[PDB]
Structure formats: structure tokens, C-alpha cells
Design an enzyme around this catalytic site. Structure first.
Site: not given
Ligand code: RRT
Ligand code: CA
Ligand code: CA
Ligand code: CA
Ligand code: CA
Ligand code: ZN
Length: 316
Positions: A57, A59, A138, A142-143, A146, A157, A166, A190, A193, A197, A200, A226, A231
Site C-alpha cells: 500500500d 500510504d 473465531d 479456527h484456521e 488447524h 481429516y 474440527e 456469527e 455468516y 439474518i 444465527d 463431509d 463438520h
């Protein structure tokens, strides 16, 4: 990038202003030299080729909409590094201060985020199901967790060990959300997502069933999708972890809560010392019991809440 360490300011996915650690060498880069061997954030430019270009970037101000996801992936990886160091005395994911890298703006309308065995990758979401994934602390943690699992227990996995993998990620991303005190909860994703809405989330630790995930071993998914429901079945372990921490009656089994900190200490210990690549739910129970015993004594209340929690979800 070799240059001078400085500090830039930007606005994240959620519109919040934060300072981020940058490096100066003609341009200002998203390279934080203050933590281990550095935290580096890359522009994947809507493509799938990785990592993309180290972010530059002119500046040191990151207020453009295109900047948002990089600002958050960059700052959130900082917070996570700090949580592991400060709380568990772990220097980066490998415990040796390995450089942490992330790529943002990956593909077009990609509704996910993942750790690929080597770096973190974040989609921008399609704008309805998700907003750019790095805007959720979160999700970020979470990533990174792993990576931690990959270097320690190495849980495969799929099936049982994959659901454990997971769950660990979900547990530690929530502990990081609490650590940062960023409106914490026992819900997952949350913040990013279904922007349209309220209320949720993608998964719930407090009540996995609220979204259709099992909260008891007898409701486990036996199928094939899955990766054998990595998951899906993670909800049985998430609910176990939520109970050890918070307590409650579940399916008639009562658990006294021992709190967050202890939860993190027992999980971390299980992960780094007792779990193997092929560990199943029953072995995780033995791992957790043994950690809590190591730490608090066989006759402790801690050991007591861990057995109760697993008995509540039908593991053991
Ligand atoms: O792959 C999936 O089904 C969704 C998922 O949990 N993905 C993980 C990557 S394993 C990333 C994530 C985590 C929390 C919240 C949103 C997104
Ligand atoms: Ca700028
Ligand atoms: Ca939250
Ligand atoms: Ca959350
Ligand atoms: Ca929502
Ligand atoms: Zn995951």
C-alpha cells in the site's frame, strides 16, 4: 521484505478501526516483524493461485473496501499468535516461531476459508451467505489451530479423528474470541455468516442441535459426505467442551462447570501430549481425563467434570 517496522491504521470487514503492524520499503507492506519469524498477508486478486502478492500500500492507511479483509486477516493472526504464546507458551504454530501467512480475496464469491498445510486462505463470500471470512476472529483462530493440530497430534481429516480435528479448531477459536473479548460467545462464525439474518451462526457449541448437528454420540452421522461428517460430528465434542467449561444438565447427566481457562489447559495438553493421528472419540476421552489428572489430580473436581461431560454426550 527488508525494511523499517512501522504501524499503519485501517478499517476491518465490520467497519472497525484498528492499528496494524507493517513494514516500510518504498511501499508499506502487510508484514509484521514483531511476532516470531513474522506475519505476512497476501493479495490473491480473485484468483486461485497461491499465495499471490505480498500486500503493498502506498500510504500506510487501509480504509478502502478492498483493504478490509487483509486488515482483519493480518490483525487477527496477530491476536491468535499472542493468545498461543501468552496462554500456552507456544511460539507460533510449529512452536518455533514459523512465519504465518495468509491470502485474502481468494477466487470469486468463495464461501469458505481453510488452512492448506502451509498457509491460511480466505474467500470473500458471496455477500449473502457470507461476508469476507477473515472478519470473524473465531474463523481466523479456527484456521490457525488447524496448523497447530498438524504439527502436534496430526489428526487425520476423516471420520472420528477428523471430527476431533474440527472440534479442537472450534474450541480454540472460541477461546481466542473470549481472550480478545470481542463480544464472545459459544457460537461459530456469527460475525460473518448471513449478513442479512441476525442472531444465527454456522455452528453452535452451546447447542449443536439448533442447526441440526448431533449433541449425543447416539446421533452420530455414519455416512460418507463431509469426509465422514468431520463438520457434523464435531458437534458431540463441542457440546462436551461447552459443558466442562460452563456446566449444565444434558440428557439427564449433570456437569459442574470448571471454566474456560481450565478447559483450554486440559484440551491443549491432550492435543500436544496424548492425541495421535488416528485417535477416536473414546481415545479423546482417555486423553482429556489423563490431562486433567496430570494437572489437577485424580481426585480433583476437574477430573470429575471431564468424565461427566463425556458421559453426558455418550462418549464412554
Ligand atoms: O467447510 C465447511 O463446511 C465450513 C467450515 O467450518 N469451514 C472451515 C474450514 S475447515 C472454515 C470456517 C470456520 C468457521 C466458520 C466459517 C468457516
Ligand atoms: Ca492506502
Ligand atoms: Ca462473537
Ligand atoms: Ca463466535
Ligand atoms: Ca447472520
Ligand atoms: Zn476446520
Amino acid at each position: 521484505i527488508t525494511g523499517t517496522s512501522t504501524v499503519g491504521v485501517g478499517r476491518g470487514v465490520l467497519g472497525d478501526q484498528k492499528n496494524i503492524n507493517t513494514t516500510y520499503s518504498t511501499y508499506y507492506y502487510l508484514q509484521d516483524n514483531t511476532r516470531g519469524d513474522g506475519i505476512f498477508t497476501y493479495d490473491a486478486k480473485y484468483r486461485t493461485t497461491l499465495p499471490g502478492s505480498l500486500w503493498a500500500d502506498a500510504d500506510n492507511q487501509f480504509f478502502a473496501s478492498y483493504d478490509a479483509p487483509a486488515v482483519d486477516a493480518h490483525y487477527y493472526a496477530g491476536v491468535t499468535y499472542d493468545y498461543y504464546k501468552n496462554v500456552h507458551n507456544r511460539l507460533s504454530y510449529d512452536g518455533n516461531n514459523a512465519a504465518i501467512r495468509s491470502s485474502v480475496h481468494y477466487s470469486q464469491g468463495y464461501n469458505n476459508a481453510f488452512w492448506n498445510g502451509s498457509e491460511m486462505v480466505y474467500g470473500d463470500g458471496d455477500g449473502q451467505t457470507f461476508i469476507p471470512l477473515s472478519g470473524g476472529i473465531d474463523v481466523v483462530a479456527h484456521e490457525l489451530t488447524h496448523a497447530v493440530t498438524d504439527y502436534t497430534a496430526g489428526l487425520i481429516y476423516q471420520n472420528e479423528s477428523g471430527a476431533i480435528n474440527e472440534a479442537i479448531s472450534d474450541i480454540f477459536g472460541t477461546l481466542v474470541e473470549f481472550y480478545a473479548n470481542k463480544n464472545p460467545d459459544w457460537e461459530i462464525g456469527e460475525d460473518v455468516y448471513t449478513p442479512g439474518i441476525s442472531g444465527d451462526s454456522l455452528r453452535s457449541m452451546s447447542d449443536p442441535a439448533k442447526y441440526g448437528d448431533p449433541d449425543h454420540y447416539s446421533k452420530r452421522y455414519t455416512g460418507t459426505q463431509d469426509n465422514g461428517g468431520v463438520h457434523i460430528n464435531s458437534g458431540i465434542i463441542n457440546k462436551a467442551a461447552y459443558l466442562i467449561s460452563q456446566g449444565g444438565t444434558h440428557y439427564g447427566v449433570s456437569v459442574v462447570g470448571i471454566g474456560r481457562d481450565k478447559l483450554g489447559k486440559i484440551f491443549y495438553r491432550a492435543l500436544t501430549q496424548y492425541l495421535t493421528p488416528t485417535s477416536n472419540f473414546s481415545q479423546l476421552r482417555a486423553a482429556a481425563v489423563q490431562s486433567a489428572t496430570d494437572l489437577y489430580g485424580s481426585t480433583s473436581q476437574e477430573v470429575a467434570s471431564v468424565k461427566q461431560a463425556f458421559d453426558a454426550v455418550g462418549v464412554k
